[PDB]
Design a protein around this ligand. Sequence first.
Ligand SMILES: [Cu+2]
Ligand SMILES: [Cu+2]
Lengths: 129, 129
Amino acid sequence: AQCEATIESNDAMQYDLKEMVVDKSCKQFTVHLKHVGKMAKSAMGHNWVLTKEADKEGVATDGMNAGLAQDYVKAGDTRVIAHTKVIGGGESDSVTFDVSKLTPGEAYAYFCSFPGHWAMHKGTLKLSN
Amino acid sequence: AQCEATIESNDAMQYDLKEMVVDKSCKQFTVHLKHVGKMAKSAMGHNWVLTKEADKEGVATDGMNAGLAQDYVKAGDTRVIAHTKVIGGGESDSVTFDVSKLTPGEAYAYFCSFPGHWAMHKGTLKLSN
Ligand SMILES: [Cu+2]
Ligand SMILES: [Cu+2]
């Protein structure tokens, strides 16, 4: 694991982890998102999107505008550090990102941009400590 | 319409159609299954299978033993005239078949072979009635 983490979503609007740490010696980090509840993505789909705190709302706004075929992230958004696909019950998806995109010590927002989800389904990630 | 019919399955094991009539001016017929329920396929997957009424249980049984990955139909089962894949909530799938495989006035059985679902409903398909 070390430069890898699994976070879970279910049929409610919270990840099991509300905080995450990337170890400073990680060159890359992989997040595995598992949807462990039984609802289909048309009813309760979820993703994991990482941005700087200040970019969360713009990414969530343009995100819900992007539609499910874009996994509710605006195509090629420069403000998205990393994002998974939208998954439904029984599915999972991973994303590996460049740890040099993270300023050490800065708190970063990770949230779900699925319709209705962005303000509830969220947490914070930081590079080591 | 024409030589196509759409049938919907929800999160109770039933179709909105109990009798499907293929018309004799059709060379091919296309069924569009829509799973209008909201649960994921691991929880409430549905499909549509067409066999002769004498073969409904044998195909269903071997199908149950074929597993979700094999769309609950045994691969290359000579008794299956047509089948879709097992789909989840919010999904759709279609199968087109050649009407020369059907005999005048003979009643055929359509069913979902997802374990149990076949035994709690009955649906018939005939050529022009
Ligand atoms: Cu969500
Ligand atoms: Cu079914």
